[PDB]
Write an enzyme that holds these catalytic residues in place. Structure first.
Site, PDB file in Angstrom:
ATOM      1  N   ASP A  91      27.935 -59.161 -33.599  1.00 21.56           N
ATOM      2  CA  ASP A  91      27.519 -57.863 -33.060  1.00 21.56           C
ATOM      3  C   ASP A  91      27.848 -56.694 -33.987  1.00 21.56           C
ATOM      4  O   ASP A  91      28.983 -56.240 -34.012  1.00 21.56           O
ATOM      5  CB  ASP A  91      28.214 -57.660 -31.698  1.00 21.56           C
ATOM      6  CG  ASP A  91      27.838 -56.346 -31.019  1.00 21.56           C
ATOM      7  OD1 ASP A  91      26.675 -55.926 -31.119  1.00 21.56           O
ATOM      8  OD2 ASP A  91      28.710 -55.742 -30.352  1.00 21.56           O
ATOM      9  N   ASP A 127      21.621 -52.990 -34.617  1.00 25.76           N
ATOM     10  CA  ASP A 127      22.476 -53.835 -33.802  1.00 25.76           C
ATOM     11  C   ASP A 127      21.998 -55.259 -33.682  1.00 25.76           C
ATOM     12  O   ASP A 127      21.044 -55.544 -32.972  1.00 25.76           O
ATOM     13  CB  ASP A 127      22.644 -53.210 -32.407  1.00 25.76           C
ATOM     14  CG  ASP A 127      23.541 -54.038 -31.491  1.00 25.76           C
ATOM     15  OD1 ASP A 127      24.322 -54.851 -32.024  1.00 25.76           O
ATOM     16  OD2 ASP A 127      23.482 -53.882 -30.251  1.00 25.76           O
TER      17      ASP A 127
END
Lengths: 379, 5
Positions: free
Chosen positions: A36, A222
């Site tokens: 992440d 992201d």
């Protein structure tokens, strides 16, 4: 140059993130950790949970140390809470070196673990400025860099195709993961991986908006996000233009909303009727920019079936947000992404694994003369 | 389906 040990070290389900294998504790406890770039905390399940097949057992680790402090981390979607501590960490199919890092032992969670995702923890690759409870908790990658000779940089290559795959190159750039040249965009501020979009196109047609709406209230990369998130105003304008471009065929409002899913007879997906989407990003040279272009194969995420039958069905992977622009997997699956932290920049190149058809291909071209790009950033 | 701070 060539990192034959790290290539192909990622896996994941469609719409459930990408993960890599890691070890924790002495002896080593194997666990899958989602990648992440949207956060900065290293956290792993450390207590029984319906969606977990295994978890971090602190009492079994002789190298475990308790920091005697709790932590709470809420995400745009999902959240967990746990206890802070440190332990020895390693990455089997990664840099051959073990390091000590802070670890949040998740003991309680809510809509965080996904049933059947196959991962049991998360690796926040962002900067400490967004680390919980505060910026004092040094992030994993930072520790890895200070404790080893690994260069301050990592690259990612996410490949669509319900198994998914890809590779995370730690400390370097693998020249076999992309074609063409790499174009870098400066990292605006070091907290999230923030960048600046200065122009948006739909099949060559400029969206014609103030280049500030594109970054309201920010634009970040992201790997931990499935869709291409777009601020409300930009979302509306893109959907409208994308509807026009594909007008030769109509779909229900539910489709564009991300609710329902369209289908077509096996192998008859009309990719050609769907427009290509291009995002122009600020370049490293003043008044200079470059653009990245994705295909409907990137923004039309394939799923099961309306009646769980046999037919090619997809879901519109472009949605609106109120927390800025999020270039998630729909964007990343089109390119090899270099997170050059040492030089405060993010590079983009056509991925050698990106999904496409014989007629069209994802692209990255430059340079384009663009004036007043600094003003594109929100304050 | 994921939206990770």
């Amino acid at each position: 140059g060539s990192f034959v040990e790290m290539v192909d070290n990622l896996r994941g389900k469609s719409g459930q993130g990408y993960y890599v294998e890691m070890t924790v504790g002495s002896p080593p406890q194997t666990l899958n950790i989602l990648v992440d770039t949207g956060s900065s905390n290293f956290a792993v399940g450390a207590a029984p949970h319906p969606f977990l097949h295994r978890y971090y057992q602190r009492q079994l680790s002789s190298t475990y140390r308790d920091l005697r402090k709790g932590v709470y981390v809420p995400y745009t979607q999902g959240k967990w809470e746990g206890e802070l501590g440190t332990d020895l960490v390693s990455i089997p199919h990664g840099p051959n070196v073990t390091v000590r890092a802070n670890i949040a032992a998740i003991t309680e969670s809510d809509k965080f673990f996904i049933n059947g995702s196959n991962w049991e923890g998360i690796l926040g690759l962002a900067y400490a400025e967004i680390a919980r409870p505060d910026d004092s908790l040094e992030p994993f990658f930072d520790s890895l860099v200070k404790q080893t000779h690994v260069p301050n940089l990592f690259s990612l290559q996410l490949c669509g195709a319900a198994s998914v795959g890809g590779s995370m190159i730690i400390g370097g750039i693998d020249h076999s993961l992309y074609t063409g040249s790499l174009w870098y965009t400066p990292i605006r501020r070091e907290w999230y991986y923030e960048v600046i979009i200065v122009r948006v196109e739909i099949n060559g047609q400029d969206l014609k908006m103030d280049c500030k709406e594109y970054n309201y209230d920010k634009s970040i990369v992201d790997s931990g996000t499935t869709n291409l998130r777009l601020p409300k105003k930009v979302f509306e304008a893109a959907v409208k233009s994308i509807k026009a471009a594909s007008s030769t065929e109509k779909f229900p409002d539910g489709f564009w909303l991300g609710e329902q899913l369209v289908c077509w007879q096996a192998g008859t997906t009309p990719w050609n009727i769907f427009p290509v989407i291009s995002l122009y990003l600020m370049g490293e040279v003043t008044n200079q920019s470059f653009r990245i272009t994705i295909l409907p194969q990137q923004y039309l995420r394939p799923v099961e079936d309306v009646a769980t039958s046999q037919d090619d069905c997809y879901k519109f992977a472009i949605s609106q947000s109120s927390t800025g622009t999020v270039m998630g997997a729909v964007i990343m699956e089109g390119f090899y992404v270099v997170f050059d932290r040492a030089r405060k920049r993010i590079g983009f190149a056509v991925s050698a694994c990106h999904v496409h058809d014989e007629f069209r291909t994802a692209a990255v071209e430059g340079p384009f003369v663009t004036l007043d790009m600094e003003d594109c950033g929100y304050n | 389906e994921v939206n990770x701070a």
